[PDB]
Design an enzyme around this catalytic site. Sequence first.
Site, PDB file in Angstrom:
ATOM      1  CD  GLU A  35      33.266  44.933  46.318  1.00  0.00           C
ATOM      2  OE1 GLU A  35      33.424  43.788  45.834  1.00  0.00           O
ATOM      3  OE2 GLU A  35      33.957  45.921  45.980  1.00  0.00           O
ATOM      4  CG  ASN A  46      39.593  37.805  42.586  1.00  0.00           C
ATOM      5  OD1 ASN A  46      38.555  38.372  42.250  1.00  0.00           O
ATOM      6  ND2 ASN A  46      39.961  37.677  43.854  1.00  0.00           N
ATOM      7  CG  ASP A  48      44.773  37.287  41.871  1.00  0.00           C
ATOM      8  OD1 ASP A  48      43.742  36.599  42.025  1.00  0.00           O
ATOM      9  OD2 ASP A  48      45.177  38.102  42.726  1.00  0.00           O
ATOM     10  CB  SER A  50      43.181  35.683  45.020  1.00  0.00           C
ATOM     11  OG  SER A  50      42.597  36.740  44.278  1.00  0.00           O
ATOM     12  CG  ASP A  52      37.328  39.317  45.778  1.00  0.00           C
ATOM     13  OD1 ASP A  52      38.525  39.169  46.102  1.00  0.00           O
ATOM     14  OD2 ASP A  52      36.920  40.230  45.051  1.00  0.00           O
ATOM     15  CG  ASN A  59      42.113  39.012  47.073  1.00  0.00           C
ATOM     16  OD1 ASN A  59      43.278  38.788  47.399  1.00  0.00           O
ATOM     17  ND2 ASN A  59      41.614  38.638  45.901  1.00  0.00           N
TER      18      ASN A  59
END
Length: 129
Positions: A35, A46, A48, A50, A52, A59
């Site tokens: 990750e 991201n 969308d 957002s 991380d 998120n």
Amino acid sequence: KVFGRCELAAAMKRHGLDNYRGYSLGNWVCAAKFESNFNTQATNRNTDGSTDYGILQINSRWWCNDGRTPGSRNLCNIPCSALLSSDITASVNCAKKIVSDGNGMNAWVAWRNRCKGTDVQAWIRGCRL
């Protein structure tokens, strides 16, 4: 902070992640590896809108607030920046809530696509826990 593998495992264990919700320590270490590559400062935008954050790529649309994610929830009640500290306490507490959400560790795409079903024990080999 970029953790070492055995160093992260130790911290994750102290924080109670080993066997948390049934996930052996190796799963957690494996997830963190894929990750963020053990980097607490890792941030990824991201599609969308957002973002991380941290060692476990928590998120911003659901878990933390970064002030630029419309319709965000901040379920862990914490500024996303806290998830970037060298002190992983915030990420761990948040992760505990995420894994308990219902889909288990499948919430971590890297874990599902690269850790799930593999010999995750290998992630803690050589570590003194």
